């Protein structure tokens, strides 16, 4: 060997380990009524209306199926 200068530009950007968020499972809350659901789910063959949908800018995700389910209004 000759040397190790570690020449390359410094790009140490080891990521965020999905930062612990605050209280979750915000379906909706209803004063003396039954709660509807924000973040529409999915008409799948497996997912039994338990998985929500990300609300992005002009698309809706899945999370566990990583497939967009958006349809026109």
């Amino acid at each position: 060997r000759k040397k190790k200068v570690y020449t390359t530009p410094k790009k140490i950007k080891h990521k965020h380990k999905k930062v612990k968020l605050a209280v979750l499972s915000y379906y909706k809350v209803d004063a003396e009524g039954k709660v509807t659901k924000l973040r529409r789910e999915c008409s799948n063959p497996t997912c039994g209306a338990g998985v929500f949908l990300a609300n992005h800018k002009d698309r809706l995700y899945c999370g566990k199926c990583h497939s967009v389910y958006k349809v026109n209004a």
């Binding site: 209280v23 499972s25 379906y27 809350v29 209803d30 039954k34 039994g48 338990g50």
Partner: protein
């Protein structure tokens, strides 16, 4: 033995992988037909875990099991959160608030005993 045997119905439930422990998990689990027996704290803080899981298990159809018990730190040892150390004193664990059950891993007479107290008093 006055209604603190819910540990043993939970403990045989865990060995057949039937506890959707955790507020996120339980809420997902009992928003389907998986809700078979539910256990709640009296109140931990701020009253809204108390509101939220109760409204989901108070749906307008048959699926309304609900059992109301004391603070969460005991309850995690009442469920399975491993602090055995082969029976050693060390508690390495935390306490859950809401445990919802599927399929209860058993045929227990305490399982026979428990629903009757849930039904008749």
């Amino acid at each position: 033995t006055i209604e603190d045997a819910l540990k043993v119905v939970l403990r045989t439930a865990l060995v057949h992988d039937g506890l959707a422990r955790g507020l996120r998990e339980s809420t997902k689990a009992l928003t389907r037909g998986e809700a078979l027996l539910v256990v709640l704290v009296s109140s931990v803080t701020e009253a809204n875990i108390i509101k939220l899981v109760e409204g989901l298990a108070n749906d307008p159809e048959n699926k309304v099991p609900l059992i109301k018990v004391a603070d969460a730190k005991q309850l995690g040892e009442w469920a399975g959160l491993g602090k055995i150390d082969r029976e050693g004193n060390a508690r390495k664990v935390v306490g859950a608030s809401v445990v919802v059950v599927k399929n209860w891993g058993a045929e227990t007479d305490e399982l026979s005993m428990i629903m009757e107290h849930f039904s008749q008093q």
